[PDB]
Structure formats: C-alpha cells, structure tokens
Design a protein around this ligand. Structure first.
Ligand SMILES: [Zn+2]
Ligand SMILES: [Zn+2]
Lengths: 260, 148, 44, 66, 62, 152, 115, 82, 50, 67, 151
RNA sequence: AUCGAGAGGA
C-alpha cells in the first residue's frame, strides 16, 4: 500500500542529452515524469515583444513568434524568477522577467543575418543558448541594405502546457520492455521488426517469451535538451515540479477534508 | 459442498477447426470416470494447455468451501477459505443452455450443459445423471487444475 | 400463468403504443421516406 | 402541376407549388375562395398550420384550477 | 483557405431587408440563415406547428 | 422529384377519427397504412403457419390431448387431469386449431408466394423470450399454464 | 475568436476549488474527487498508486472532456478504510517515491560527472 | 356531440403532450398557480412535466373531427404514455 | 421465385414451378391477354397507363 | 519563407543549421551526410532541413520601402 | 424563442426520440467508424482486460451501478473480457440474437450451433452479451439490432 | 446599397 523504491542508472550524460534508466517504478509514474519533462518544467522564453522599427520582409508577428522560440539559458535563474501572475509589480520587473534588446540595421551591401547573437540581455545569466560561450547562432531574419529591425523583448517564466516555446526538451525518447515480454504490443510478424537499442536477445529470437506475471519496470529515457536547461536539470526540475504538484494537491485535499 | 460436477478430463484435441483466436484455444476433451465430452475455451496465454494433458475439472456453484451463495460481484479483499486455492485455472460464467435427447414423451438420457465464461464457451455433454446441478441462467465456476 | 398474464399485458400496451397518432403528417412523412432513398439509387 | 394543381386544393396551396401567377390569375378570374385548410395556406398567412401540434385546440379548465 | 473563423456566423435580431422585412443575406450583412422549403417540409413531418410558425412568421417578419 | 412529392402529399394527415385525409377533407385511407399503425413501432416477424405443410402444421399447432405421457411431461398433474377428462376444454382446443387452419388459408390467399416475413407491431417471440427470462421459466419442467387459459 | 488562453489549463479561476470531494451514493465507501486544472499527469499516477493499496476496491480517473481542464478520480475502499484516507496516502506515497527518485538521480548524476 | 360517447383515442397524442406541456409551461412562467408541490423546481418546463405526471394540468384538449364536431378531453382523462 | 409459378402442393407446401415466361419490348396488354394459352390472370405490364 | 527556429515535431533547434547545411552542400556533401554532420538524427528534423525552401532570399531581391 | 416551441422540440424532435425512423422501421443512427471497428475487436473471444484497464473503462460508463463484475477468469490472474464489459454497457434486460458478418452459413446446421468456434452468432440474454462478436449487424442501423431492440 | 455575373464550399 506504499511507495515504490525506484532506482536510477544514468547510461550517458552530455551537454545535449541525458540517457538514463528508472527501475522498480510504475508505468504511470514513468509516464508522468516523461510528460513533466515536456509540459511542466519551467524555463525562460521571450513572451513579450515591442517592435519599434521593422523594415524587414517578415511582418511583426513573424519576428515575435520567431523570437519566442529562441531558447534562453534558464539554469539557475528560472528557480529564482517569479511568474508575472505572482509578482506584485507592474507589467514587468527584474524579479519576474528579463529584458532583451535588438537593434540591427543593414547598411552594407551583403545580406545582414540578424541572429540570436543580436539579442542583447540585461541579465548576463539569461542569454540565447547559441550565444553562450561550433553551433551557429539561430537566424532571426535576413536584412537587405536599408532594412532595419529594432525591438525590445521581455522573457518570462512558463512551461510547455502554456506554449511549446517553454518546452525545454528537443525530444524525449521513452521506452520500456524492449523485448516484447509483456506483449503490450502484438506484432503480426515479430520477425519483421528491428530490435530496440536496449534489447537483450540473440538475433534468431525476435521477441522475448511472454511473461504472464510481468509488469512494466525498467523504463529507458533519453531526454534531449533544447539548450535552456541542462538535461539533468530538466530531469531534476521535472521531479521537483511533479512533487510540488502533488504537495499542493495534498494541501488542498487537507483543506477539503477538514472543511467537511 | 456447492459442487455441481467433478471429473478428470484428458485433452484429446486442441482447435480441430484451426486456431480461431490467438490467446484463446478450444479443447475437445473426454473424461474416464463418467464418459463426458467437453468443449472448453481457455486462455492459453496465461494457462497453456498441451495435447494429451490430463486435468481435474470442477463445475461449482460457489467458491466458498461451506455452502454459501455468491453475489456475482468482485471482492478481491475476501479472506474466507475459497476452493480456488486448490486449483490453477478458475473461470466464472453462466449456464445459457441445456440440451438433451428427450422426446415429447421420454425424458433425457443424455444432457448437454452450455456455459459462457464472459464469452469463453464450454459445452459439457454426457449422461443426464451427472448434469442435474446445471440450470439455465445460473452462475458457476470452472475450477480446473492440471495433474501429472 | 404469471408469465402469460404479463405477456398479454405487454402485447396490449405495445400494440396501443404502435397506433398512429392523430395529427401525424403522414403525407409529408411519406414524401420524405420515398424521396430520401431516391438520392442514393443510381441515375443510370 | 398537371395532376396536383388540377385538384380542388385551393389557389394558395397551388401557387406554392408551381404556376404561381397562372393559378392566382385563374382564381381571380373565377372568384375562387381558399378555405385555408392546408398547411401551405396557413404557413403563408403566418397562422398555426392544422398539422401535428396545431390539429386541436386547448381550453382552460375553470373547474380544475381550484 | 477554408478556416472556420471566416465561416462562423450567428444572428439574433439584426438588420432586415428593405423590400420584405426579413433578415439580410450573408455573414457580411449580419444576415439570417434561410429556413427554406425543405426545412418547412421537415418540420411539417415532425408535426412541430408552433416551431414552424416561429421560424416562418415570428423569427422572420412579423 | 422530392419537391413534387412533398407538394403533392404535404397536407395529408391522420385525423382524430383515425382516417387519413387531405386538405379538401377527402378520404385517402380509412386507416393509415390500412392498419392504423405508425411506422416506428412495427418490425419484421415471421408467420409460423404460412410455409409449413399440412402434416407439419397439424403436428406443430394441433394440441394433442390424447397422449397422456406427453401432457404429463408438458403440464402439471391437475392440468393434465383437467385436459384429459374435460370435454369442454377439448372442444375449445379443437376449435382453436380450426380457427388457426382458417387463418392459414387466409394467409395463403394474402401471400400467394410463400413469404412469411411480415411487418407487424409487437415482436411476439421477443416478448415471449422476455417473459421467459423475467419469470425464470425452466424449459425442462412441466408448466402450470392451462391451455384453456391460453385460449381465453 | 474562441481560443481560450493557454493558461486556463493550469490556472484556477477565482472562487474555483482545486479539489472537490463528493460522496458516491451508488456503493458504500466510495468518493468522487473532482480536481480542477489537472490532467492525465496527476490522474494517472494517483490512480495507479491507489491501485497498489489492497484496501482500495476501485480506483479510476477520467478527463470528462479534453477541452475542459478537470479530472474526476473515483475511489472505493474497504469499509474499515476511507477513500479520502486512501487518496491522502496515495499522494504521500507518490511524494516519497519522487523524493527518493530525485535524491537517487542526483547521486547518479554526481557519479556520472565524477566517474 | 354526445360527451357520453367520445370516439377519439383515450391516449394523449405526442403532439397533445408537446403542446399541453408548452402551454402550461408558459402559463407557469406567466405566474399562474402551480397545481403540484415543488421541491426546488424553477424551470417552467419541469413544473409542467411534474403536473402532467401528477395529472394536474388544468387544460382541456378540444379535438376536432373531420365532420366539424369536437370532443373535449381533460388532460387528466387521457392516458399519458411518455 | 418472384416470377416462377408458386403453387400449393396437395401436401400443403409452397412449391415454385419453373415455367416459361415471355417478356415483350412493347405493350399490347389488351390483345396479349386475349390470346390462347396466355394466362389472363397473371399477365401484366409495367406501363401503368395501359 | 525562412528556416524555422524549432523542429515542428520535437522542438529541436534547426534555425542555426540552415547556413551550415548550405555550406556543407557546397562542400560536396550529400544531403543525408550533411544532415548527419549537423546532428539531425530524427527524420522530423531531417524533414525540416531537407524540405525547406529559402524564399526570404527571393524576397530580398526587392528594394525596401525606405532607403 | 418560446417555452411552447421549446416544449414542442423537446417532446417531438429531440434526437433520442429520433433514433428509429418511420421510413423503414429501423434505427437511423448506429455505432460508427472507430467505435464499430473497436467494438468488433473488443468483443472478440480473446480480449482480456486487467483490473486497472477495467476500472479505467468503468469510469466512462454513465449507467454503472458501481459494482465491479466478477472477472471471467479468476486464476492464475484476474481478467475480465470485452463481452463482460459490454454486458455492463448493454441496458436493461434486452434479449437479442444476431450473427457476425463472418458467420459461416453451414455452422447453424452442423454441431457447435450454440457454441460457435468463430465466436459468431451474437447472443445477448438479460442484457449480458453471452457470446458473439458485435459489428454493423448488431450495432448498426439495420432492423432487429441491439440499438433497435434497446429502443 | 442594389443588381447582376463569376469563382468556390458541403
Ligand atoms: Zn514582476
Ligand atoms: Zn525534430
């Protein structure tokens, strides 16, 4: 009637992704962790734009949408910043937002690539990922001689439930039972299917013998980071966020039980 | 006791018409103590059954060792002594037909009780003496155990 | 006897329920019932 | 029109179907009177068609309001 | 090209045509939807005489 | 075609005397569908006495009140004694079979092709099945229904 | 024109309760927990943790409409137990599991970066 | 027409039920007295259906015959099916 | 069986006799009916006006 | 008109790869090898780079509204 | 726009009152694409549901008495069948006989008429799907189907 | 705004 005692085994850790395995947990816990990776791990992203001048060939909403999708390093700052809902300030303040400025003008004859390097921030900790000290800079717009783009953005705290720009992942590979032992899939021709990278089967064997007493355990994860957070920071923040969702739910539950 | 029928059967054929369903298999079996034919649908995925196997089949009206009716509701938190403890494969179904060789004037010498365990069908046919416990629209249990 | 009496009552009630209601526009209803299938049957 | 507008259905029902002008002109020349029995005639005049819920009248029951 | 926002339309006592005082035609005119002959026939088959009178008398041009 | 049909039949209606009439008040049908029944409640059924042979019809519909042991298998003891002893009941059952045979000839002239599929209000076999399951009728035991009660 | 703001899936409206408990009258010792502004993420884990309790006879959840942003979790327990107590223990167990998982993931990361 | 012998059906037609319920619901909405008791109903349609189930709608249905005569049936005199 | 000759045998069963039938490309129902060895009872036409 | 920022499917950043992709293509890489060099392993991101039409280069052939 | 017209529509033209059409004395609406392919797959003989799956499905029954039915298989592991859950979906105590579209025509003659090898020959008794694979013939718009008999 | 025409949707 009590909690699982999950174990963890990290099989790869780079700056780009983290590949790990959780054992002795329920499939619902594993999938809620997977969902929180995508939808409830907050990060910083541009969510307010003011175009002072845009002579480029892309209209204002195009530039704004494009700026919103630039990942901003959010590692230690996202926990400190507040949601503008919770901030007791006006529209903005340094406690709930980060100011960016962009001011580019193509005077020279070659096309000027307005890239994420031109997004200048007031906060040194929250900068475009590509601008962080290889991979090139994200391209915001190409400008022709005489074209000019001057804008002022504000980045906010949010998560992927509100908009995919606050999603920190560039793909969450999730898998379990690589050999189809639980038979949660039913291959019409099991020989036709390639083997999982996590499979432990000799090549003559297509799928594992059916396990009637089996349950999903040993979930394999590959959490790729878009750049804002480190992959391990994505996983840790996901676990913390899920735990705070449950804690808030329990607080409200206690108020409802005692009020009855 | 609550047992409508008990005998030892021997699997004489499996899927004469061919495999119709993947996880379900039809066994055509015959006993020795009563000379009763049996067609039975079993989930071979969880309880595989091979040709020539020999098992004890017990059609019961209840699982409780003492005479006590069942409510037809699922109660996993039940600590009473259940006779399902003494068997490996247990199903729960209802009798939906009782045929016989009766005439307009003569009673039936042979009966044929049909049971459905949530769609897995069984036909137990043989002497009418061994099938007086069966009544249509009545809930029963399978209670089947393999023996060597 | 109980089953037969219940059966008689059931037949009577369902028959009285099958009787056409005064005010049914059976002509418009029949025109629709004959024109709707006409939209599916083949021209050639 | 050769079978439906040749019966005694009333000029307003007939004008709804076909030959609106010819029908109404014939009725004028012959002084025909539409008794407003069909559904088309009542629908045109915005009156309750004698159809379905309109095939009867409701009266208040003074002896039962007590 | 067929986006729902260019198709959604509603009316409740909007403008009316000059000749016959009935709702206008079209989204652009804030018009009403046509309760046509086939709708009249359907509601006659239903036997809904008050709804038929509401649609063809009271919701169009009393 | 649809518009033409509608304008031709639009005002035909079932009146409170149960006749179907047009706007002119002329009578189109004395009863709707020749049977005064609505088309939603009727459903497909089978006439059981249309197709069978004379021998099969006799064997399936003639109540046999001479076979004592067959009645003993079908009916309870008091019902068997009343059916075998009483002659008023036997004449009632005999006239029941004669009436069914007359009905058979009427069906044979109504359906000159042997098609027993008919559309009728109440699905009597389904109602009988409903009664069997509602009252837990045991098909193997003798019944307590008097055949005279069935006829009456 | 009709697009709800994206925050309405996560944010509670003023005067709207996060969770509401309603006694289920069909069977005894059953309750319906209507949780607002949550989705399958918490519903699935709460249900599956409740299924681990042998004193829980029923544990299910549903999102009645995807366009709406609430879940309903039905919990039935044995008579000596309570669905509110079962729900509380399920949340406590999930919290403890996630705390342990977080600490062990921190340890695994430390081992991986170090050696 | 002899009220002692009314030839029309003793059942309320679906159209009679529809119009009687609508009429009585409008009457209730216009502050007419209610004939049945009320727990918490405030919708006139629900009150009218409760009155019909209770057989306490003070309305008479005047069914016209093709010949021109009519038959008056109290809503309590008819058989309510649905 | 819709065009076969459905009779009732002496035993009381419906029997479908397989018999020759003619289908014409024009209609003279008035004349064809009054011909020897032509059935004036079942012979019909699809021209409702005739 | 311009290379998207993220992959529509996963959300991987592809905005910084268009210029590198073109530079690899003029370096006599095949499109597949070029996509492998940029680290686009999921066929969604390979779709993003491989099916992109740089229309902005044609929109920059028109003089702007202001000099 | 009036209580009278509202009552008219509520008592005459509401969709449940419109399930059976007078045109052909059969249902006009039936079970349709995904629900029909899925109910065919669901009522196959080898569909076994686990306890959590069964509770998930029972969450979506509006007309559920809150009693979990006794599983068709108790050992070695409790498993409910798709027919056992559709029996909960089926209302009242209706009785119905149909035949799945793949029902062989020479099966009703030989043995196994009442124990079908192919799980054809739909039989619903007392509102329980005793046997058979449901399909268009059982849940579609034809005459004598489960939806018609339910209405 | 009207009218007409055209292009489309189901
Ligand atoms: Zn602030
Ligand atoms: Zn991608």
């Amino acid at each position: 009637p009590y909690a699982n005692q999950p174990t963890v085994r990290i099989t790869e850790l780079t700056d780009e992704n983290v590949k790990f395995i959780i054992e002795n947990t329920d499939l619902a816990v594993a999938n809620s962790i997977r969902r929180v990776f995508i939808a409830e791990v907050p990060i910083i992203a541009i969510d307010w734009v003011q175009i002072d001048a845009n002579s480029s060939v892309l209209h204002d909403e195009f530039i704004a949408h494009r700026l919103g999708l630039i990942p901003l390093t959010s590692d230690d700052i996202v926990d400190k910043l507040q949601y503008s809902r919770d901030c007791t300030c006006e529209e903005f303040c340094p406690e709930c937002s980060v100011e960016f400025t962009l001011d580019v003008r193509c005077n020279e004859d070659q096309t000027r690539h307005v890239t994420s390097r031109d997004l200048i921030s007031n906060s040194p900790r929250v900068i475009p990922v590509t601008s962080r000290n290889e991979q090139d800079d994200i391209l915001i717009v190409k400008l022709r001689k005489g074209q000019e783009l001057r804008l002022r953005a504000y980045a906010k705290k949010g998560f992927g439930k509100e908009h995919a720009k606050w999603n920190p992942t560039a793909g969450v590979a999730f898998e379990y039972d690589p050999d189809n032992a639980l038979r949660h899939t039913v291959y019409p021709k099991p020989e036709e299917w390639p083997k999982s990278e996590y499979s432990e089967l000799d090549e003559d064997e297509s799928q594992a013998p059916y396990d009637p007493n089996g349950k999903p355990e040993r979930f394999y994860y590959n959490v790729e980071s878009c750049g804002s957070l480190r992959p391990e920071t994505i996983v840790l923040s996901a676990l913390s966020g899920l735990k705070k969702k449950l804690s808030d739910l329990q607080t409200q539950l206690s108020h409802e039980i005692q009020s009855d | 006791a609550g047992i409508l029928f008990e005998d030892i059967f021997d699997v004489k054929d499996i899927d004469p018409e061919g495999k119709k369903f993947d996880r379900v298999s039809r066994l055509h079996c015959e006993s020795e103590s009563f000379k009763m034919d049996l067609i039975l649908d079993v989930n071979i995925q969880i309880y595989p059954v091979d040709l020539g196997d020999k098992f004890r089949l017990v059609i019961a009206s209840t699982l409780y060792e003492d005479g006590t009716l069942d409510d037809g509701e699922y109660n996993p938190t039940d600590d009473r002594p259940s006779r399902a403890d003494q068997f490996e494969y247990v199903m729960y179904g209802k009798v939906y037909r009782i045929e016989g060789d009766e005439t307009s004037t003569e009673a039936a010498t042979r009966l044929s009780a049909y049971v459905s365990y949530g769609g897995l069908l069984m036909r137990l046919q043989g002497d009418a003496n061994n099938l007086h416990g069966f009544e249509v629209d009545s809930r029963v249990y399978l209670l089947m155990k393999k023996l060597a | 006897g109980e089953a037969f009496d219940w059966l008689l009552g059931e037949i009577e009630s369902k028959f009285n329920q099958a009787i056409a209601h005064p005010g049914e526009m059976v002509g418009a209803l029949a025109a629709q019932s004959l024109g709707e299938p006409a939209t599916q049957m083949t021209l050639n | 029109r050769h079978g439906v507008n040749r019966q005694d259905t009333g000029p307003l029902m007939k004008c709804s179907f076909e030959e609106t002008v010819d029908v109404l002109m014939e009725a004028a020349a012959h002084g025909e009177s539409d008794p407003m029995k069909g559904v088309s005639e009542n629908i045109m005049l915005g009156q309750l068609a004698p159809a379905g819920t309109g095939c009867f009248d409701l009266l208040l029951d003074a002896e039962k309001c007590k | 090209k067929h986006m729902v926002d260019d198709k959604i339309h509603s009316r409740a006592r909007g403008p009316i045509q000059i000749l016959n005082r009935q709702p206008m035609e079209g989204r652009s005119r804030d018009g009403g939807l046509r309760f046509g002959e086939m709708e009249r026939d359907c509601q006659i088959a239903h036997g809904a005489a008050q709804f038929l009178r509401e649609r063809l008398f009271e919701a169009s041009d009393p | 075609i649809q518009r033409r049909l509608i304008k031709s039949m639009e005002s035909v209606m079932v009146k409170y005397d149960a006749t179907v009439r047009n706007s002119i008040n002329q009578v189109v049908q004395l009863r709707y569908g020749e049977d005064g029944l609505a088309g939603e409640s009727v459903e497909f059924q089978n006439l059981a006495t249309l197709k069978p042979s004379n021998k099969a019809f006799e064997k399936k519909f003639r109540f046999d009140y001479t076979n004592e042991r067959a009645l003993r298998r079908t009916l309870q003891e008091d019902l068997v004694k009343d059916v075998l002893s009483n002659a008023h009941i036997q004449n009632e059952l005999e006239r029941e079979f004669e009436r069914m045979r007359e009905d058979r000839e009427v069906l044979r002239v109504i359906f000159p092709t042997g098609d027993s599929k008919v559309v009728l209000p109440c699905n009597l076999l389904r109602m009988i099945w409903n009664a069997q399951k509602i009252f837990h009728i045991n098909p193997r035991l003798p019944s307590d229904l008097h055949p005279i009660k069935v006829v009456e | 024109m009709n697009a709800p703001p994206a925050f309405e899936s996560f944010l509670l409206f003023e005067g709207e309760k996060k969770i509401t408990i309603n006694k289920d009258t069909k069977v005894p010792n059953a309750c319906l927990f209507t949780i607002n502004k949550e989705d399958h993420t918490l519903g699935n884990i709460i249900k599956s943790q409740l299924l681990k309790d042998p004193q829980v006879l029923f544990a299910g959840y549903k999102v009645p409409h995807p366009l709406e942003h609430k879940i309903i979790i039905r919990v039935q327990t044995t008579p000596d137990y309570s669905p509110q107590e079962a729900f509380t223990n399920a949340i406590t167990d999930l919290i403890s599991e996630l705390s342990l998982l977080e600490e062990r993931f921190r340890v695994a990361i430390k081992d991986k970066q170090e050696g | 027409q002899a009220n002692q012998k009314r030839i029309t059906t003793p059942y309320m037609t679906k159209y009679e039920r529809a119009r009687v319920l609508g009429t009585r619901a409008l009457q209730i909405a216009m502050c007419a007295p209610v004939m049945v008791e009320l727990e918490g109903e405030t919708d006139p349609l629900l009150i009218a259906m409760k009155e019909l189930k209770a057989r306490k709608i003070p309305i008479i249905i005047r069914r016209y015959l093709p010949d021109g005569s009519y038959e008056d049936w109290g809503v309590d005199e008819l058989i309510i099916s649905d | 069986d819709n065009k076969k000759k459905i009779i009732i045998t002496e035993d009381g069963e419906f029997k479908a006799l397989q018999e020759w039938i003619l289908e014409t490309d024009g209609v003279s129902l008035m004349r064809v009916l009054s011909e020897k060895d032509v059935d004036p009872v079942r012979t019909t036409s699809n021209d409702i006006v005739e | 008109m311009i290379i998207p920022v993220r992959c529509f499917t996963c959300g991987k950043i592809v905005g910084n790869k268009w210029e590198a992709y073109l530079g690899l293509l003029q370096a006599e890489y095949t499109e597949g090898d070029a996509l492998d060099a940029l680290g686009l392993k999921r066929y969604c991101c390979r779709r993003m780079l491989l099916a992109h039409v740089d229309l902005i280069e044609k929109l920059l052939n028109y003089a702007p509204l202001e000099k | 726009q009036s209580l009278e017209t509202r009552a008219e529509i509520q008592e005459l033209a509401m969709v449940p009152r419109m399930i059976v059409t007078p045109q052909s004395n059969r249902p006009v609406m039936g079970i349709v694409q995904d629900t029909l392919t899925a109910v065919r797959k669901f009522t196959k003989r080898d569909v076994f549901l686990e306890r959590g799956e069964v509770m998930n499905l029972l969450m979506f029954l509006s007309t559920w008495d809150g009693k979990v039915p006794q599983p068709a298989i108790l050992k070695p592991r409790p498993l409910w069948t798709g027919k056992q859950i559709f029996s909960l979906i089926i209302p009242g105590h209706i009785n119905c006989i149909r035949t799945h579209s793949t029902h062989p025509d020479d099966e009703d003659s030989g043995p196994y008429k009442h124990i079908s090898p192919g799980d054809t020959k739909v039989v619903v008794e007392n509102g329980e799907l005793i046997m058979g694979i449901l399909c268009k013939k059982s849940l579609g718009t034809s005459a004598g189907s489960l939806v018609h008999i339910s209405y």
